[PDB]
Write a new protein. Structure first.
Length: 378
């Protein structure tokens, strides 16, 4: 009862609940509650959707389309995606967010925490949980920024043999509406049933891309979500639609992180500790167990990038260690600077996709290539 009771309340603030779930990576049976909320189809009425459209794309917005699907295909973090076709026959996907979602952030976040605190299920983590939550939700609402990020990433991936970013339809974009070209295929959410051979090459290319986003582009998504990676079986390509929480970082800052991964693969615990303190992962005076919990959680990363043999991300053991790559918050109060939080969250979220898809492939070659390019720039 209390279960379905909580679920029903959290759906009224679905975006905040899910974003909070990402920050803690799914503990009690609250993981079920979050999953149920993730499956909940609490969509905003069409009237509301038509309001944001007419109030952003103009009263004659439907004059631009041959067809507008009234039933949403799926729910976004804050909006929902409706499929449509433009007057010329071009198939597109329109992500429409609701009016005032940005002004409802503080109220929704507080309602979320009130539900969780009252339920006495939260791990009861630190103040810092609200500040980061309101910050990430504000970023997702800025669809104009999201559009710009998508155009930039599309250029970075120009001519790539596996990844591509769908083009943006500026004619149908706005602060509350983001429209892209239709993509063929399905999100990796529904790719568990694919061949072990397909899933290994999908995840191999995702992890290589992860290394480039971190140490070559310096332009990465904070929380990777396999629901936003569409796999096209016909073309054997992956369409990238996960650019809602994108940020840039100084090459010097990401250079400290690659030194940590270097040391991790070299089993140099002291350098991992020293550079970790330099990045403010650690303050240097964390109790022995808190520091060892952070250094231990990193061993899994060094294990993969140091093995010239295939690394199995889907094992029960490795899977559990990959889900614990968020020790950055547990009993851990300047907080871990949001820049540091996002870098380790990009790496860990990438390993997570490899684990959920039960992927297995070598990882040493791709990192030595990434570290080589680093030394060249240096
Ligand atoms: C993750 O976020 C987004 C997801 C989508 N979904 C889609 C995009 C393109 N083709 C699709 C085809 C089908 C089919 N059958 C279903 C969904 C599609 C669109 C977005 O922007 C317009 C997003 O936001 C950036």
């Amino acid at each position: 009862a209390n279960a379905e009771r909580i679920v029903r309340t959290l759906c009224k603030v679905r975006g905040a609940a899910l974003k909070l779930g990402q920050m803690l990576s799914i503990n009690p049976h609250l993981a079920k509650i979050f999953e149920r909320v993730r499956q909940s189809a609490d969509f905003m009425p069409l009237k509301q959707m038509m309001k944001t459209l007419n109030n952003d794309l103009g009263p004659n917005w439907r004059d631009k389309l041959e067809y507008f699907e009234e039933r949403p295909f799926a729910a976004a973090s804050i909006g929902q995606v409706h499929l449509a076709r433009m007057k010329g026959g071009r198939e597109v996907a329109m992500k429409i967010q609701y009016p005032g979602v940005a002004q409802s952030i503080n109220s929704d976040v507080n309602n979320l925490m009130a539900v969780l605190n009252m339920s006495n299920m939260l791990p009861e983590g630190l103040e810092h949980l609200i500040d980061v939550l309101r910050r990430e939700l504000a970023l997702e609402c800025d669809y104009q920024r999201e559009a710009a990020c998508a155009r930039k990433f599309r250029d970075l991936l120009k001519g790539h043999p596996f990844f591509y970013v769908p083009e943006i339809v500026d004619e149908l974009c706005s602060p509350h509406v983001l429209t892209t070209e239709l993509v063929s295929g399905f999100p990796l959410d529904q790719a568990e049933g694919l061949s072990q051979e397909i899933r290994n090459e999908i995840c191999y290319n995702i992890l290589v891309l992860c290394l480039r986003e971190l140490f070559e582009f310096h332009f990465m998504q904070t929380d990777p979500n396999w629901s936003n990676f569409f796999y096209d079986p016909q073309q054997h390509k992956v369409a990238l639609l996960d650019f809602g929480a994108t940020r840039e970082y100084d090459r010097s800052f990401t250079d400290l992180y690659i030194q940590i991964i270097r040391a991790a693969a070299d089993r140099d615990r002291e350098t991992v500790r020293a550079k970790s303190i330099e990045m403010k992962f650690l303050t240097g005076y964390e109790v022995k167990v808190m520091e060892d919990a952070h250094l231990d959680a990193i061993l899994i990363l060094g294990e993969a990038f140091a093995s010239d043999e295939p690394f199995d991300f889907g094992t029960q053991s490795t899977t559990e260690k990959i889900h614990n790559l968020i020790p950055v918050m547990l009993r851990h109060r300047v907080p871990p600077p949001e820049e540091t939080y996002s870098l380790h969250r990009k790496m860990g979220g990438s390993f997570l996709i490899c684990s959920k898809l039960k992927a297995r492939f070598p990882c040493k070659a791709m990192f030595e290539e990434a570290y080589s390019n680093y030394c060249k720039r240096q």
